[PDB]
């Protein structure tokens, strides 16, 4: 129903920072939760309320904005294809790659 | 398969208003004999369904590891469910236990989310909360509600269990066949230790009533499990909750149950919820 | 949608054994008042179904050219069907007219092949012939069978007609909505010319019985048309013929109808046919 | 369920004769009626009984055998793609391109 496109992937030296962008197209009115995975849960924002849930491994180092993912303090373990995701209905269960039905192609991020 | 929910609802409503007729026309009859003869009669119906639908038998699919869920759900909902529900009937009334047995989907809507990791965060919660509010607005109480929630937890957890087995390689007709087999074994064990008499079942009228009740109940369970299979546990119970509307309608129409204004309001609330869910 | 046939069967069986109960508990009641009040009550149920399923109303789909088939089938099966069936009841018995109304699928299995160019050449013909043989083995006769075949032609041709309209751009709920609207108009015209009294309908008990009968009959017709839509007129009537098994079962169980050995043989024959069809 | 292959098509001078072949592969045990169209009904044989129904336009000029279609007395009106067909169940209704569910690709026959 919604087409997701990712941008900003590439190679980054460890110890810096990076920004990744996700653009959604289509019926974007009733999507509750937006997400950012690499399929582990790394970020998930709620549209109306404005809260952002993260992973404990990166909680406090990565940040979400409305979708922009700003990742700081990069480590070589972060080399992965990052995927976007949306949820038709959501209250309190983010970060799971079975709730989110709308899936993107993902872009590669390699930390050196 | 959205109509299967409402079909299970109407067929369980018919089964329940047949059970009320049976227990009203017969005084000496006891629920343990009725449940046992019901299950023993319905096992034949299930064998018929299985033989007609597909090949004769497939017992290699009844693996011991996975189907512990269905047997534990059957012995947790069938025997002790009915026992505690009859306890509630004797304790706090004949029609409040049924109301709690209808408010059952709360525990199911909690478990399916938490235990099975299902995604029902905000869509169904409102309809189910509205149905719950209607059932509580319809109405020693601290122990009656305790036994009632003990019945509701079991009858709402059989659904979460039954949607756990059927995830992979267990059709609707077999996951219910083992359920009825195990409930029949459990009721047999219960009756043998108490030496409950089987003289009442020999009556032809009672046998006819039991076979129509078993047919209704079994079509209900089959439609309900076909729903659960492809509509999950979160809404497939909420859609089935509609059976209270039916039960009340058939009680005030056929059995001549008195009609009050509060029951009309409760039925309107629950039908509003059921319409909201779709 | 193979189970929808059997569901239409069981629900028409429930409707028919409710109609028998109504006409048995009330003597002064006449079939013309009953059919009229049934249709007037069921029109509300159909509006509810349509409003819940999809958008409020779609009257641009009720084109005048195509839906002549459904109106002619409704006025050919509803009014004159019931009139000639009651004539057969008064002529040759209360239970032979129903047996012919169950042997009805012969004319449908002929028309669907010849008129609609359907391809049922050898698969279904055997099951339907076996059902027909069972119904004739169950049993002035030259005029009774004439009126009975006049009822059967109409009740088997409504199916061929109803599968003609729904080929393109007519869902199950609308093709039946117009049917009930037109049958209600026809019964209204018939009653108005005869000035049939409406005082009996005001009874609350009769109204409850009529609403449950209308609900059963309407779920039956809805499932039956969902079948016809995706299972055609050739087998979707044969599968529904199973309602005689039910009707007999519910008559010998609930209404206390006497059981004879010949009826068991006829029921076994027709259930064998219904099982052969799948 | 059944794959149909046709052979023998080509150009033929009017006034001669031609033979067209159809081979069926797959679950070929329960197919009742075999057919030959050009989607008008031109030929249809029954397997068990062995009767052959034709079109009145060509009845007596074309013949079927068990599938071989031998067409005699060719006319320029016979230029068409001929298709094979089978029927899961059949008693008396051949020549209709809605009864036959198994369809081939057809070969071109041009009469000059
Ligand atoms: C709805 C199904 C309800 C479950 C079974 C029917 C409820 C009990 C009932 O309605 O019984 C009535 C009678 O039975 C019915 O009418 C049942 C309804 C008929 C159709 C039921 C199936 C579809 C509904 C009451 O009359 P009685 O039993 O006092 O009469 C004695 C009998 O006539 C002695 O010969």
mmCIF file of C-alpha atoms in Angstrom, chain B:
data_model
loop_
_atom_site.group_PDB
_atom_site.id
_atom_site.type_symbol
_atom_site.label_atom_id
_atom_site.label_comp_id
_atom_site.label_asym_id
_atom_site.label_seq_id
_atom_site.Cartn_x
_atom_site.Cartn_y
_atom_site.Cartn_z
ATOM 1 C CA UNK B 1 -13.329 -15.466 6.837
ATOM 2 C CA UNK B 2 -15.316 -12.836 8.730
ATOM 3 C CA UNK B 3 -18.771 -14.547 8.573
ATOM 4 C CA UNK B 4 -17.405 -17.649 10.311
ATOM 5 C CA UNK B 5 -17.085 -15.709 13.559
ATOM 6 C CA UNK B 6 -20.744 -14.709 13.592
ATOM 7 C CA UNK B 7 -21.690 -18.220 12.458
ATOM 8 C CA UNK B 8 -19.857 -19.745 15.418
ATOM 9 C CA UNK B 9 -21.673 -17.189 17.551
ATOM 10 C CA UNK B 10 -25.151 -18.109 16.338
ATOM 11 C CA UNK B 11 -24.434 -21.838 16.548
ATOM 12 C CA UNK B 12 -23.095 -21.658 20.096
ATOM 13 C CA UNK B 13 -26.143 -19.571 20.981
ATOM 14 C CA UNK B 14 -28.364 -22.314 19.598
ATOM 15 C CA UNK B 15 -26.371 -24.942 21.494
ATOM 16 C CA UNK B 16 -26.663 -22.995 24.741
ATOM 17 C CA UNK B 17 -30.403 -22.415 24.391
ATOM 18 C CA UNK B 18 -30.779 -26.136 23.686
ATOM 19 C CA UNK B 19 -28.773 -26.941 26.821
ATOM 20 C CA UNK B 20 -31.026 -24.658 28.859
ATOM 21 C CA UNK B 21 -34.065 -26.480 27.459
ATOM 22 C CA UNK B 22 -32.544 -29.866 28.339
ATOM 23 C CA UNK B 23 -31.643 -28.886 31.897
ATOM 24 C CA UNK B 24 -35.099 -27.339 32.328
ATOM 25 C CA UNK B 25 -37.092 -30.334 31.072
ATOM 26 C CA UNK B 26 -34.979 -32.750 33.164
ATOM 27 C CA UNK B 27 -34.332 -32.209 36.875
ATOM 28 C CA UNK B 28 -32.321 -35.275 37.928
ATOM 29 C CA UNK B 29 -29.844 -34.700 35.090
ATOM 30 C CA UNK B 30 -26.351 -33.570 36.092
ATOM 31 C CA UNK B 31 -23.822 -31.561 34.041
ATOM 32 C CA UNK B 32 -21.140 -34.258 34.267
ATOM 33 C CA UNK B 33 -23.325 -36.867 32.569
ATOM 34 C CA UNK B 34 -24.463 -34.299 29.997
ATOM 35 C CA UNK B 35 -20.940 -33.161 29.111
ATOM 36 C CA UNK B 36 -19.668 -36.744 28.919
ATOM 37 C CA UNK B 37 -22.486 -37.959 26.674
ATOM 38 C CA UNK B 38 -22.190 -34.792 24.561
ATOM 39 C CA UNK B 39 -18.496 -35.409 23.955
ATOM 40 C CA UNK B 40 -18.945 -39.138 23.335
ATOM 41 C CA UNK B 41 -21.701 -38.370 20.821
ATOM 42 C CA UNK B 42 -19.734 -35.585 19.128
ATOM 43 C CA UNK B 43 -16.634 -37.734 18.653
ATOM 44 C CA UNK B 44 -18.612 -39.645 16.013
ATOM 45 C CA UNK B 45 -19.588 -36.381 14.309
ATOM 46 C CA UNK B 46 -15.931 -35.352 14.222
ATOM 47 C CA UNK B 47 -14.873 -38.698 12.745
ATOM 48 C CA UNK B 48 -17.565 -38.204 10.096
ATOM 49 C CA UNK B 49 -16.338 -34.685 9.295
ATOM 50 C CA UNK B 50 -12.750 -35.916 9.011
ATOM 51 C CA UNK B 51 -13.604 -38.925 6.833
ATOM 52 C CA UNK B 52 -15.726 -36.792 4.498
ATOM 53 C CA UNK B 53 -13.317 -33.850 4.231
ATOM 54 C CA UNK B 54 -10.067 -35.692 3.449
ATOM 55 C CA UNK B 55 -8.423 -39.111 3.786
ATOM 56 C CA UNK B 56 -9.479 -41.659 6.414
ATOM 57 C CA UNK B 57 -7.069 -40.794 9.247
ATOM 58 C CA UNK B 58 -3.745 -38.994 9.677
ATOM 59 C CA UNK B 59 -2.321 -39.921 13.086
ATOM 60 C CA UNK B 60 1.283 -39.014 12.233
ATOM 61 C CA UNK B 61 0.219 -35.362 12.529
ATOM 62 C CA UNK B 62 -0.790 -35.889 16.191
ATOM 63 C CA UNK B 63 2.753 -35.332 17.417
ATOM 64 C CA UNK B 64 3.259 -35.539 21.165
ATOM 65 C CA UNK B 65 5.467 -32.453 21.496
ATOM 66 C CA UNK B 66 3.323 -29.727 19.936
ATOM 67 C CA UNK B 67 -0.224 -30.865 20.747
ATOM 68 C CA UNK B 68 0.364 -30.701 24.508
ATOM 69 C CA UNK B 69 -1.110 -27.215 24.089
ATOM 70 C CA UNK B 70 -4.421 -28.529 22.787
ATOM 71 C CA UNK B 71 -4.770 -31.277 25.406
ATOM 72 C CA UNK B 72 -3.935 -28.876 28.236
ATOM 73 C CA UNK B 73 -6.424 -26.363 26.842
ATOM 74 C CA UNK B 74 -9.118 -29.020 26.550
ATOM 75 C CA UNK B 75 -8.674 -30.326 30.088
ATOM 76 C CA UNK B 76 -8.344 -26.719 31.317
ATOM 77 C CA UNK B 77 -11.540 -25.470 29.635
ATOM 78 C CA UNK B 78 -13.793 -28.524 29.408
ATOM 79 C CA UNK B 79 -13.801 -30.308 32.774
ATOM 80 C CA UNK B 80 -12.784 -27.615 35.241
ATOM 81 C CA UNK B 81 -14.392 -24.862 33.183
ATOM 82 C CA UNK B 82 -17.807 -26.502 33.413
ATOM 83 C CA UNK B 83 -17.204 -27.531 37.037
ATOM 84 C CA UNK B 84 -16.389 -23.992 38.184
ATOM 85 C CA UNK B 85 -19.180 -22.552 36.029
ATOM 86 C CA UNK B 86 -21.719 -24.838 37.717
ATOM 87 C CA UNK B 87 -20.163 -23.807 41.031
ATOM 88 C CA UNK B 88 -20.858 -20.192 40.038
ATOM 89 C CA UNK B 89 -24.429 -21.138 39.095
ATOM 90 C CA UNK B 90 -24.964 -22.622 42.552
ATOM 91 C CA UNK B 91 -23.194 -19.661 44.183
ATOM 92 C CA UNK B 92 -24.294 -16.349 42.663
ATOM 93 C CA UNK B 93 -26.949 -17.184 40.079
ATOM 94 C CA UNK B 94 -27.726 -19.085 36.890
ATOM 95 C CA UNK B 95 -27.257 -16.165 34.470
ATOM 96 C CA UNK B 96 -24.268 -14.238 35.857
ATOM 97 C CA UNK B 97 -21.847 -17.105 35.230
ATOM 98 C CA UNK B 98 -22.916 -17.048 31.576
ATOM 99 C CA UNK B 99 -22.389 -13.280 31.484
ATOM 100 C CA UNK B 100 -18.816 -13.724 32.707
ATOM 101 C CA UNK B 101 -18.322 -16.618 30.296
ATOM 102 C CA UNK B 102 -19.291 -14.048 27.650
ATOM 103 C CA UNK B 103 -16.955 -11.365 29.053
ATOM 104 C CA UNK B 104 -14.201 -13.988 28.721
ATOM 105 C CA UNK B 105 -12.349 -12.391 25.721
ATOM 106 C CA UNK B 106 -10.460 -10.028 28.062
ATOM 107 C CA UNK B 107 -7.910 -12.646 29.112
ATOM 108 C CA UNK B 108 -7.622 -13.798 25.492
ATOM 109 C CA UNK B 109 -7.026 -10.270 24.181
ATOM 110 C CA UNK B 110 -4.328 -9.888 26.837
ATOM 111 C CA UNK B 111 -2.584 -13.221 26.212
ATOM 112 C CA UNK B 112 -2.644 -13.092 22.402
ATOM 113 C CA UNK B 113 -0.798 -9.779 22.627
ATOM 114 C CA UNK B 114 1.672 -10.588 25.403
ATOM 115 C CA UNK B 115 2.345 -14.317 25.009
ATOM 116 C CA UNK B 116 1.854 -14.960 21.276
ATOM 117 C CA UNK B 117 3.234 -11.543 20.211
ATOM 118 C CA UNK B 118 0.159 -10.595 18.182
ATOM 119 C CA UNK B 119 -0.427 -7.083 16.876
ATOM 120 C CA UNK B 120 -3.846 -5.875 18.050
ATOM 121 C CA UNK B 121 -2.564 -2.814 19.877
ATOM 122 C CA UNK B 122 -5.424 -0.387 19.179
ATOM 123 C CA UNK B 123 -7.891 -1.716 16.564
ATOM 124 C CA UNK B 124 -9.814 -4.425 18.463
ATOM 125 C CA UNK B 125 -9.155 -3.214 22.022
ATOM 126 C CA UNK B 126 -11.906 -0.602 21.776
ATOM 127 C CA UNK B 127 -14.643 -2.950 20.586
ATOM 128 C CA UNK B 128 -13.697 -5.528 23.199
ATOM 129 C CA UNK B 129 -13.565 -2.897 25.964
ATOM 130 C CA UNK B 130 -17.008 -1.685 24.904
ATOM 131 C CA UNK B 131 -18.399 -5.234 25.008
ATOM 132 C CA UNK B 132 -16.833 -5.670 28.458
ATOM 133 C CA UNK B 133 -18.384 -2.411 29.632
ATOM 134 C CA UNK B 134 -21.783 -3.526 28.388
ATOM 135 C CA UNK B 135 -21.524 -6.872 30.154
ATOM 136 C CA UNK B 136 -20.486 -5.227 33.428
ATOM 137 C CA UNK B 137 -23.237 -2.603 33.076
ATOM 138 C CA UNK B 138 -25.728 -5.458 32.764
ATOM 139 C CA UNK B 139 -24.876 -6.067 36.454
ATOM 140 C CA UNK B 140 -20.133 -12.909 48.756
ATOM 141 C CA UNK B 141 -19.674 -11.088 45.437
ATOM 142 C CA UNK B 142 -15.894 -11.100 45.933
ATOM 143 C CA UNK B 143 -15.814 -14.906 45.763
ATOM 144 C CA UNK B 144 -18.420 -15.144 43.004
ATOM 145 C CA UNK B 145 -16.414 -12.811 40.785
ATOM 146 C CA UNK B 146 -13.297 -14.793 41.735
ATOM 147 C CA UNK B 147 -14.751 -18.102 40.545
ATOM 148 C CA UNK B 148 -16.203 -16.317 37.510
ATOM 149 C CA UNK B 149 -12.796 -14.940 36.529
ATOM 150 C CA UNK B 150 -11.351 -18.412 37.112
ATOM 151 C CA UNK B 151 -13.812 -19.714 34.512
ATOM 152 C CA UNK B 152 -13.140 -16.791 32.163
ATOM 153 C CA UNK B 153 -9.343 -17.179 32.283
ATOM 154 C CA UNK B 154 -9.626 -20.823 31.242
ATOM 155 C CA UNK B 155 -12.218 -20.247 28.529
ATOM 156 C CA UNK B 156 -10.199 -17.352 27.113
ATOM 157 C CA UNK B 157 -6.908 -19.222 27.301
ATOM 158 C CA UNK B 158 -8.188 -22.245 25.387
ATOM 159 C CA UNK B 159 -8.351 -19.891 22.392
ATOM 160 C CA UNK B 160 -4.776 -18.643 22.756
ATOM 161 C CA UNK B 161 -3.648 -22.258 23.134
ATOM 162 C CA UNK B 162 -5.683 -23.459 20.142
ATOM 163 C CA UNK B 163 -4.121 -20.732 17.985
ATOM 164 C CA UNK B 164 -0.657 -21.867 19.104
ATOM 165 C CA UNK B 165 -0.898 -25.414 17.725
ATOM 166 C CA UNK B 166 -2.612 -24.557 14.429
ATOM 167 C CA UNK B 167 0.247 -22.253 13.383
ATOM 168 C CA UNK B 168 1.973 -25.091 11.506
ATOM 169 C CA UNK B 169 0.609 -28.429 10.258
ATOM 170 C CA UNK B 170 -2.651 -28.851 12.190
ATOM 171 C CA UNK B 171 -5.934 -28.246 10.390
ATOM 172 C CA UNK B 172 -9.161 -27.066 11.993
ATOM 173 C CA UNK B 173 -10.758 -30.513 12.152
ATOM 174 C CA UNK B 174 -7.846 -32.348 13.796
ATOM 175 C CA UNK B 175 -6.932 -29.688 16.381
ATOM 176 C CA UNK B 176 -10.555 -30.017 17.523
ATOM 177 C CA UNK B 177 -10.669 -33.813 17.243
ATOM 178 C CA UNK B 178 -7.867 -34.211 19.792
ATOM 179 C CA UNK B 179 -9.582 -31.570 21.939
ATOM 180 C CA UNK B 180 -12.812 -33.562 22.096
ATOM 181 C CA UNK B 181 -10.982 -36.882 22.555
ATOM 182 C CA UNK B 182 -9.096 -35.519 25.555
ATOM 183 C CA UNK B 183 -12.143 -33.816 27.071
ATOM 184 C CA UNK B 184 -14.038 -37.106 26.758
ATOM 185 C CA UNK B 185 -11.198 -38.998 28.440
ATOM 186 C CA UNK B 186 -11.110 -36.420 31.243
ATOM 187 C CA UNK B 187 -14.858 -36.551 31.851
ATOM 188 C CA UNK B 188 -14.691 -40.360 31.777
ATOM 189 C CA UNK B 189 -11.982 -40.356 34.451
ATOM 190 C CA UNK B 190 -14.024 -37.885 36.508
ATOM 191 C CA UNK B 191 -17.214 -39.953 36.257
ATOM 192 C CA UNK B 192 -15.531 -43.285 37.031
ATOM 193 C CA UNK B 193 -14.144 -42.049 40.352
ATOM 194 C CA UNK B 194 -17.565 -40.696 41.376
ATOM 195 C CA UNK B 195 -19.568 -43.604 39.871
ATOM 196 C CA UNK B 196 -22.096 -41.286 38.240
ATOM 197 C CA UNK B 197 -25.073 -43.189 36.842
ATOM 198 C CA UNK B 198 -25.598 -43.451 33.077
ATOM 199 C CA UNK B 199 -29.248 -44.548 33.206
ATOM 200 C CA UNK B 200 -30.608 -41.174 32.061
ATOM 201 C CA UNK B 201 -28.823 -41.233 28.688
ATOM 202 C CA UNK B 202 -30.753 -44.309 27.509
ATOM 203 C CA UNK B 203 -33.875 -42.173 26.992
ATOM 204 C CA UNK B 204 -34.676 -41.665 23.319
ATOM 205 C CA UNK B 205 -35.877 -38.088 23.750
ATOM 206 C CA UNK B 206 -32.745 -37.198 25.707
ATOM 207 C CA UNK B 207 -30.596 -38.878 23.050
ATOM 208 C CA UNK B 208 -32.265 -36.831 20.316
ATOM 209 C CA UNK B 209 -31.789 -33.617 22.269
ATOM 210 C CA UNK B 210 -28.157 -34.551 22.893
ATOM 211 C CA UNK B 211 -27.442 -35.281 19.233
ATOM 212 C CA UNK B 212 -28.962 -31.996 18.059
ATOM 213 C CA UNK B 213 -27.081 -30.160 20.830
ATOM 214 C CA UNK B 214 -23.847 -31.899 19.848
ATOM 215 C CA UNK B 215 -24.399 -31.061 16.174
ATOM 216 C CA UNK B 216 -25.017 -27.387 16.978
ATOM 217 C CA UNK B 217 -22.080 -27.178 19.387
ATOM 218 C CA UNK B 218 -19.749 -28.946 16.967
ATOM 219 C CA UNK B 219 -20.622 -26.777 13.978
ATOM 220 C CA UNK B 220 -20.026 -23.839 16.324
ATOM 221 C CA UNK B 221 -16.602 -25.089 17.416
ATOM 222 C CA UNK B 222 -15.620 -25.927 13.836
ATOM 223 C CA UNK B 223 -16.566 -22.498 12.479
ATOM 224 C CA UNK B 224 -14.843 -20.896 15.471
ATOM 225 C CA UNK B 225 -11.594 -22.772 14.850
ATOM 226 C CA UNK B 226 -11.711 -22.041 11.114
ATOM 227 C CA UNK B 227 -11.993 -18.395 12.154
ATOM 228 C CA UNK B 228 -9.129 -18.601 14.674
ATOM 229 C CA UNK B 229 -6.980 -20.296 12.027
ATOM 230 C CA UNK B 230 -7.236 -17.347 9.624
ATOM 231 C CA UNK B 231 -8.463 -14.484 11.810
ATOM 232 C CA UNK B 232 -6.195 -15.090 14.860
ATOM 233 C CA UNK B 233 -7.185 -15.222 18.504
ATOM 234 C CA UNK B 234 -7.532 -11.457 19.155
ATOM 235 C CA UNK B 235 -10.679 -10.803 17.117
ATOM 236 C CA UNK B 236 -11.877 -14.326 16.451
ATOM 237 C CA UNK B 237 -13.104 -14.397 20.057
ATOM 238 C CA UNK B 238 -14.473 -10.853 19.977
ATOM 239 C CA UNK B 239 -16.546 -11.650 16.893
ATOM 240 C CA UNK B 240 -17.845 -14.797 18.594
ATOM 241 C CA UNK B 241 -18.881 -12.842 21.717
ATOM 242 C CA UNK B 242 -22.003 -11.947 19.705
ATOM 243 C CA UNK B 243 -23.517 -15.237 20.901
ATOM 244 C CA UNK B 244 -24.939 -13.454 23.960
ATOM 245 C CA UNK B 245 -27.278 -11.417 21.729
ATOM 246 C CA UNK B 246 -28.519 -14.635 20.146
ATOM 247 C CA UNK B 247 -28.806 -16.551 23.444
ATOM 248 C CA UNK B 248 -30.937 -13.747 24.899
ATOM 249 C CA UNK B 249 -33.071 -13.530 21.746
ATOM 250 C CA UNK B 250 -33.753 -17.278 21.641
ATOM 251 C CA UNK B 251 -34.410 -17.339 25.389
ATOM 252 C CA UNK B 252 -37.010 -14.567 25.199
ATOM 253 C CA UNK B 253 -38.562 -16.025 22.019
ATOM 254 C CA UNK B 254 -38.655 -19.814 22.419
ATOM 255 C CA UNK B 255 -38.125 -20.680 26.097
ATOM 256 C CA UNK B 256 -40.348 -17.793 27.205
ATOM 257 C CA UNK B 257 -37.773 -15.929 29.263
ATOM 258 C CA UNK B 258 -39.019 -12.597 30.666
ATOM 259 C CA UNK B 259 -37.765 -9.478 28.906
ATOM 260 C CA UNK B 260 -36.459 -6.481 30.851
ATOM 261 C CA UNK B 261 -35.329 -3.060 29.684
ATOM 262 C CA UNK B 262 -31.770 -3.447 30.999
ATOM 263 C CA UNK B 263 -31.141 -6.564 28.903
ATOM 264 C CA UNK B 264 -32.181 -4.643 25.783
ATOM 265 C CA UNK B 265 -29.602 -1.979 26.626
ATOM 266 C CA UNK B 266 -26.892 -4.592 27.199
ATOM 267 C CA UNK B 267 -27.747 -6.328 23.918
ATOM 268 C CA UNK B 268 -27.625 -2.985 22.103
ATOM 269 C CA UNK B 269 -24.215 -2.233 23.634
ATOM 270 C CA UNK B 270 -22.749 -5.589 22.644
ATOM 271 C CA UNK B 271 -24.189 -5.465 19.117
ATOM 272 C CA UNK B 272 -22.757 -1.950 18.793
ATOM 273 C CA UNK B 273 -19.375 -3.354 19.781
ATOM 274 C CA UNK B 274 -19.624 -6.263 17.342
ATOM 275 C CA UNK B 275 -20.516 -3.817 14.568
ATOM 276 C CA UNK B 276 -17.619 -1.562 15.584
ATOM 277 C CA UNK B 277 -15.163 -4.444 15.241
ATOM 278 C CA UNK B 278 -15.800 -4.523 11.473
#
